[PDB]
Ligand binder design. Sequence first.
Ligand SMILES: Cc1cn([C@H]2C[C@H](OP(=O)(O)O)[C@@H](COP(=O)(O)O)O2)c(=O)[nH]c1=O
Ligand SMILES: [Ca+2]
Length: 129
Amino acid sequence: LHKEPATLIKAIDGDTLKLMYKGQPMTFRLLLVDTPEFNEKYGPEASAFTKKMVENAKKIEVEFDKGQRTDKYGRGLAYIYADGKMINEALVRQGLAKVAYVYKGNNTHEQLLRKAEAQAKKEKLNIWS
Ligand SMILES: Cc1cn([C@H]2C[C@H](OP(=O)(O)O)[C@@H](COP(=O)(O)O)O2)c(=O)[nH]c1=O
Ligand SMILES: [Ca+2]
């Protein structure tokens, strides 16, 4: 896999954001995770977490997996990095997302994320509290 440039347009919530990619606005959905919706427990916290990471970032990158790059809603499906730190992994490590939506063929970072979730679970963080 490889990282490609993008710039932030707008934070949306814990696991979605609007980025400019190859010069075009698109909404991205984070691969392999599920944050609570804003109206759910920890939703506001997940939103804030992702917003801070992307807004503070000097460099945002998107990394597609090997499979589908757009979902049925037209959202880009990627791993998204802020100054080299993967947001998908960071949310999970903090107990602000569950590993979820693991579809065959777009699952390159599955085991990395599951290891993060185990450690969040051990620490009884947030969702796991
Ligand atoms: C993360 C992800 C979501 N989706 C689809 C599955 C779910 O369909 P349904 O809308 O029919 O439930 C939805 C969940 O996204 P959200 O968690 O953003 O609601 O997005 C994908 O198809 N591929 C993906 O990799
Ligand atoms: Ca969600």
